[model samples]
Target: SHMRILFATVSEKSHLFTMVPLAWSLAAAGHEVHVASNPALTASIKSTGLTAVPVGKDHNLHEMLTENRDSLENPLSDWSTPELDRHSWEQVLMKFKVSVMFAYQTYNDCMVHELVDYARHWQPDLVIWDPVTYAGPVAARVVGAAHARLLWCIDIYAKMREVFLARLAEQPEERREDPMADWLGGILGRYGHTFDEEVVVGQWTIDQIPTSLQLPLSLRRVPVRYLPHNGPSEIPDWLREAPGRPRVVLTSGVSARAALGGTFMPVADMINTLGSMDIDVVAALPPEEVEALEKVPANTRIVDFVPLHALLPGASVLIHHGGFGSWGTALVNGVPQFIPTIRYADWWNKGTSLHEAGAGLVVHASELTAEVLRESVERLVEDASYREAAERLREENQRTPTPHDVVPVIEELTAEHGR
Candidate 1:
């Protein structure tokens, strides 16, 4: 009754952060788990006690940002200048294409081909995929294994299409073009009709995302379900030792370290401003830059890392970089957030969603200052409406089962496939 499972994920820290909980859940449940990721992530992946299979050459985003440090470091830097917004969106698309290409190349050029070939020789029953890794679905199909997609953030495939359609409707007739349709159509063409047909018409489809956020009607067609991320069970000793006061958790995501210019500037100012208040502030900062926090007030505790799941429950407010993982953590804990979005549409998407849910406020990274940050945090914590909304979302999150509960469904699928 042994099962072997393969998890395919991107190499980024945020991506791995989302997958770690699920991997731990599977491993603890006594399944043989192996992770296939880029060479850069080998050590990190192995740290989870799962077998690591290095598939691709290192394509580190941090390195890319470092190479273009002058431009990427500052929001106002004139890398693209007047066309920065357009150029930024194009850059995202370009990165997306490059990522897909690299995944394909990795599957083809490395021992992955051989490893998969050998696996086929001794077929495993199931493959769990991070949807971002397009290679996962392709590999599963190649090996004729059962597979399911795990969502780390809001599922774009679920609600993004509607957002696109709404925008399309708002456009003038001359400016109308369905980008999502064009994108999906291009994907269908690139994969060929046969492969596309199977994905579109598969019998056993399962997705790990909240049904509330998903396209309500599409839920019937696709058997999508929610599986929250897992983290350390206990809060950090520092947080546990703190006296009772309105607590605010501040984190700029892992990559925010690369975004040095004005992003952390506001956070520093906020820390100084809130020092006079009768509350506690816990900021998740990068270890290397902890020395730069010379201005932090004694009321604020700056740490490189803390157990978010444990600390969030006690926090009255959360301030973040709008990364999906952080957003999910805050949402589930039922704490109101002041999201300062930095890159891509991250701030735009998560911030807007939180605003609509009445659980948070979104401030543009450029507009954020000490006063704005202080006021936003105060409004979220002091306002009964924001607290009520956050409680409602928390209730919803509480009602939904944890990833541990959903992982057994994956096991059942693998068992059914004779893994």
Candidate 2:
């Protein structure tokens, strides 16, 4: 039977990209698919060949987080650690209070009413949404649709929620301040739908992270292989030819570099340091940064943009800033990676996971010297164990269901959960 499915997210491009393959798969399976977001992402959504429903006004959540590092730098905000022993009730409560006011509400408030209205009219069988897009679950509940969250990165949000709830259980009922629920409850009441825990989490989760790296959560999950869909990309003429030497790719992923306004790593220094080495270096940097380079090393290729999906298959090693696209790309390609552990946005979690798997090595920004960079690449190249481990991880990823393979599973789940 044909079913209508709606995908929801904020104005984030990378998040939308991650969901594209699955959306297309559902469509291919003879189901209706529509992507809903702020007006700013409508063009991007259309580029993926999916129908775009512009719900509400765009929010400045990205700009706010980028401008104010303090907003994302809080120790309490870091949920990379799945264990709740380190967090306290007061601290967790404060985290939720601040996040509802700044992060969650800022992103979802504008979209909720419009999204709910669309859900009522469309009557979608299921709603799949980005992890932080609270409006998605609210709308799904309003229309009585089965809803699941598609994770773009690690399960930090779910883990954090568990920690918060565990600590909340220990607190006195009077002091139990649940800002997330209160705000969400207020919105749900407007549609005559009271808050359920599912509104915060979901009926289930569509997880993309490999089994070795993900947290052991009690929630229902559907493991899906992460296909590298970095938006419409064309292969360059130069990339068609095989590299003369072992190739090393240096990137600060598409969304990360754009969000930071530039690459945080010392690109020029690394390129110059690796110039004397036998390997060929390809640095994907912005045009301005490339122009600022005093001189391009003879062994290095600096391009303003090139798709990692196109570049990684033939590469020997990857050195990156630990963003989702770059990390997943390397994982699928079975390419050994070297990354600097960035603190914000689960980058640190990626580093630790890769390092523990012996598929990559992690270095802090402070310890990432030119020699350190050279040595890391050298080890990645000469060490056969890294390549072997990476291949094993890639095999593990392949064993999970691909987007195409998950379509039937999604259909069955929707039928089981939807009204």
For each candidate, what is the lDDT? 0.60, 0.84
Clashing pairs in 1: 125-419
Off by over 4 Å in 1: 66-122, 157-194, 197-209, 215-236, 259-266, 343-347, 411-419
**lDDT score of model 2?**
0.84
TM-score of each: 0.75, 0.94
Compose the digit string of candidate 2's lDDT tens values, residues 1-419.
89999999988887799899889999998999999999989999999999999998998766665554231335655556646676778777777787789778888998889999999999999999999899999999998999999987788778878988999899887888789889999999987989999888889899989978987787889999999987779998998789878999887543454443323445678778888799988988766567668988889888877888989996899887677778899999999998875555677788888889999998865567888888899999999999999999999999999989988888888888898
lDDT of 1 at 138: 51
Q: Highest lDDT, which number? A: 2
Cα distance off (Å), candidate 2, residue 107: 1.6
**Backbone atom clashes (below 3 Å) for every candidate:** 1, 0
lDDT of 1 by residue, 41-119 (tens): 7887776666887874665455655444231423322111222234333343343344335443433334334445544
